[PDB]
Amino acid sequence: VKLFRASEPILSVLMWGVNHTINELSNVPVPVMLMPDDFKAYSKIKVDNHLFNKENLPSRFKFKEYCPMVFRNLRERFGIDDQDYQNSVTRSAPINRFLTTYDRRFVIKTVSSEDVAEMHNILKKYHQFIVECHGNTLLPQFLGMYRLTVDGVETYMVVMRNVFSHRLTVHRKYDLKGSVAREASDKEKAKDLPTFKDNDFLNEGQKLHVGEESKKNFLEKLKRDVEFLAQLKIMDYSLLVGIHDVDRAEQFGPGEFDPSVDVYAMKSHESSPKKEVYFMAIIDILTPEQYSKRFNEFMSNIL
Amino acid sequence: KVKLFRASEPILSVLMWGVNHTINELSNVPVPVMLMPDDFKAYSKIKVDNHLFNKENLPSRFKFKEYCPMVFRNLRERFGIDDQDYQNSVTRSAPINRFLTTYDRRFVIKTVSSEDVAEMHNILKKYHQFIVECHGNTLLPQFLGMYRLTVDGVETYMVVMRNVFSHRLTVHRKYDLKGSTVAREASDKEKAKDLPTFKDNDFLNEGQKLHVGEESKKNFLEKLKRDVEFLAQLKIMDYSLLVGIHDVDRAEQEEMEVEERAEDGPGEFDPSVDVYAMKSHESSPKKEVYFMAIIDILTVNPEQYSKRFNEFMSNILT
Ligand SMILES: Nc1nc2c(ncn2[C@@H]2O[C@H](COP(=O)(O)O)[C@@H](O)[C@H]2O)c(=O)[nH]1
Ligand SMILES: Nc1nc2c(ncn2[C@@H]2O[C@H](COP(=O)(O)O)[C@@H](O)[C@H]2O)c(=O)[nH]1
Ligand SMILES: Nc1nc2c(ncn2[C@@H]2O[C@H](COP(=O)(O)O)[C@@H](O)[C@H]2O)c(=O)[nH]1
Ligand SMILES: Nc1nc2c(ncn2[C@@H]2O[C@H](COP(=O)(O)O)[C@@H](O)[C@H]2O)c(=O)[nH]1
Ligand SMILES: Nc1nc2c(ncn2[C@@H]2O[C@H](COP(=O)(O)O)[C@@H](O)[C@H]2O)c(=O)[nH]1
């Protein structure tokens, strides 16, 4: 029994919406291949309830899903069961725009009209790339795209796999581009979880010890990714890096995690100083050669 | 577990889609302690525009309206119908025949007019009360859902009710009885149909009689009494008693000829399912099952119509 109780009616519509579309899809046969029209397709539902079911939900609202067959396919290729996706969004209000499902597995990002256009723009190629690389990639994993209409207002959302662990705490965040010079602001430098940048990183001497095992895979991955982003003539994307300090945690065991769920996590190396878990993925790709090449190096340095 | 809502006509796919949709939604809605007055003016309305998506069985564009859903859910409960069952009966496979039956013959789906839906609203509060205080024991139509479908910009109203007839037992003869003083008979056109709808004068001509025996006759006549009086209270007129007769032996042979043909439990029913069914008196000639319900509830005035109706239906059985 799902009430879709959330701190805000937008979020209730979202939960209602994700629940409705996933159910709907469960009655849609899984096709032998995606078709070009699936890339221009959408489900639209308009709800108008008179004197009924008002407790958590608005009486009137619209919910639109973009390209449901493509995103259902992406979920699969990313190793994600539709029923778990649904459960993550609906069992409980997502929490604090940049939201997270209650179980921290999926990030829910508000985006713009042009963003959604940019997405349509790259979606066939992005899909094809996901196929070719068998789901293994540092790129953002796009799970669903949606427009909500509440109180006459439209709101676009993209749902992604969370870069960070969902049960492990992060002690560092470093947004990295590799160019110029970027730093953390005074105002921000004193927040609980500071979003440091390139220079703040190098001026700390911070390195990441994953061995040459993990580094070989990671770098091979990184280049094919940024090459793809470049071939798409895209840029200004960062490498989000999270650092979890095991020991500090002690102040179901520490450092323990499920690689199939925390897809970006990486164990520290034997021959390494402190014991930690790193999280590394490419974020912010919705907007060339020079940027890629550079970003590729700067990243291959800290490691 | 996939449901395609495959059907001969888009309207039917939409119906299946809608009952399925509204039942799931209702499942995330607490069962109230009691119904509230707004519940009697409530409705749900969904509007779908699919673009290049999910077009095999459903239209791309349609609307589904459920009237007073909280009331009808509660009605289903008081008639001992589980929502899952109802949903399955409607959605597992297309209704068949406007007048439809669920593929499993448990429920009837009648296409009705805007006026009908209006009349349903007029009487809905009192009907519910009357169903509460007779504990669901009535010859009246038992209403389970009311819907408006929209396909190709055309509106279609439907009411879902329980089948007057058994869902297993075959009917071999049926009558529509009113008791009117006017003449009422089966047309020449009708008589040549497979299962003709005979009328008042045909039933009398045939010397027909229904042998239910005294304990059942009383329980029936007591239902009829409050039912018609209730209908009388409301402005209601010109409803009929639907009478279906099932011949036990004839069915046994028909079954027999059904196997032999393919080659190339004894006149009983569940009274919690076949709610209008009565066995024949243990002293009847032929062994029989009857089904008897009032239908169509949406000079002579209602009170006198009821009175007429009553005395006739009372002389129909023995
Ligand atoms: N916990 C978490 N934070 C993220 C993730 N992706 C991006 N972020 C953070 O959320 C912020 C909001 O997005 P942005 O400000 O870059 O538009 C980002 O700057 C980044 O610090 C993620 O997957 N998990
Ligand atoms: N008495 C009553 N009639 C209604 C109500 N809602 C719809 N109707 C009637 O039912 C028919 C169809 O209404 P519609 O739902 O198509 O607007 C019309 O005759 C309309 O007046 C209601 O809440 N109360
Ligand atoms: N659509 C709609 N129609 C109504 C509603 N209330 C009444 N009607 C229609 O208006 C007629 C007159 O209302 P009444 O005088 O019987 O209360 C009803 O028989 C019904 O057809 C309503 O709330 N919604
Ligand atoms: N099997 C079955 N037939 C019904 C039921 N109610 C009405 N009918 C049939 O529907 C017709 C009467 O309603 P009509 O659709 O003409 O208004 C008659 O042919 C009658 O036999 C029912 O509950 N079950
Ligand atoms: N009443 C009755 N009729 C039968 C029986 N067996 C066959 N008949 C009838 O006799 C005719 C021949 O049936 P058949 O033997 O060809 O199936 C058919 O009309 C069939 O309905 C039976 O056991 N009882």
Residues whose CB is less than 8 angstroms from the CB of residue B94 and which lie 6 or more positions away in sequence, other chains included: B6, B7, B8, B12, B13, B16, B103
Q: Is B264 one of the catalytic residues?
A: no
Cα(B250) to ligand 5 centroid in Å equals 10
Shortest CA distance from B53: residue in chain A:
A41
Resolution value (Å, 1 decimal): 2.7
CATH code: domain A1-162 is 3.30.800.10
Residues whose CB is less than 8 angstroms from the CB of residue A227 and which lie 6 or more positions away in sequence, other chains included: A292
CB contact under 8 A, B28 and A3: yes
- Residue B50 Cα, gap to closest chain A Cα (Å): 5
Ligand 3 in reach of B36 Cβ (< 6 A): no
Q: Which of residues 27-66 of A touch B (CB under 8 A)?
A: 27-29, 37-38, 40-53
Does B57 count as an annotated binding residue?
no
DSSP assignment letter at B171: P
Choice from B46, B121, B147 to test ligand 2 binding pocket (greatest atom count within 8 A of CB):
B121
Q: Which of A137, A243, A149, A255 is nearest to A196 (CA)?
A: A243
CATH classification for the domain delimited by B1-163, as one of 3.30.800.10, 2.40.50.140, 3.50.50.60, 2.10.109.10 = 3.30.800.10
CATH code: domain A163-303 is 3.30.810.10
Cα(B42) to ligand 3 centroid in Å equals 13
Helix (H, G, I), strand (E, B) or coil at A153: strand
Which tokens belong to B197?
């709808």
Choice from A78, A99, A106, A107 to test ligand 1 binding pocket (greatest atom count within 8 A of CB):
A107
Which ligand gives the minimal distance to the CA of B293? Answer: 4
Q: How many angstroms separate the CA atoms of B69 and B77, rounded?
A: 12
Using a CB–CB cutoff of 8 Å, tell me whether A200 touches chain B.
no
The CATH H-level superfamily of B164-317 is 2-Layer Sandwich (3.30.810.10)
Residues whose CB is less than 8 angstroms from the CB of residue A280 and which lie 6 or more positions away in sequence, other chains included: A138, A163, A208, A218, A239, A240, A241, A242, A264, A266
Of A37, A49, A51, the CB nearest to B41: A51
Helix (H, G, I), strand (E, B) or coil at B270: coil
DSSP assignment letter at B40: G
Q: Which of A218, A94, A238, A97 is nearest to A166 (CA)?
A: A94
Give the determination technique: X-ray
**C-alpha angle with apex A285: A211 to A156, nearest 5 degrees?**
130
Q: How many CA atoms lie within 13 A of A234 on its CB side?
A: 23
Q: How many CA atoms lie within 13 A of B239 on its CB side?
A: 29
Length reported for chain A = 303
Annotated catalytic residue, options B82, B126, B209, B238 = B238
Q: Are strands B107-112 and B99-101 parallel, antiparallel or unpaired?
A: antiparallel
Are residues A267 and A210 in contact, defined by beta-carbon separation less than 8 angstroms? yes
Strand order in the sheet with A60-66: A98-100, A106-111, A153-161, A142-150, A60-66, A42-48, B43-51, B61-67, B143-151, B154-162, B107-112, B99-101
Residue ranges per structural domain of chain A: 1-162, 163-303
Strand order in the sheet with B288-295: B197-199, B173-177, B240-247, B288-295, B277-279
Are residues B16 and B90 in contact, defined by beta-carbon separation less than 8 angstroms? yes
Number of Cβ within 10 Å of residue B315's Cβ equals 11
Which tokens belong to B28?
């995330």
Residues whose CB is less than 8 angstroms from the CB of residue A13 and which lie 6 or more positions away in sequence, other chains included: A57, A58, A61, A63, A148, A150
Helix (H, G, I), strand (E, B) or coil at B105: coil
Number of Cβ within 10 Å of residue B136's Cβ equals 14
Q: What is the torsional sign of CA A265, A268, A270, A275?
A: negative
Phi/psi at A192 (5° precision): -55, -55
- Partnered with residue A49 across adjacent β-strands are none
Ligand 3 in reach of B118 Cβ (< 6 A): yes
Determine the angle formed by the axes of helices B302-316 and B214-233, rounding to 10 degrees: 170
Q: How many angstroms separate the CA atoms of B114 and B116, rounded?
A: 5
Ligand 4, atom 17, lies closest to the CA of: B296
Q: How many angstroms separate the CA atoms of B30 and A56, rounded?
A: 12
Q: Which of B91, B81, B70, B77 is nearest to B146 (CA)?
A: B70
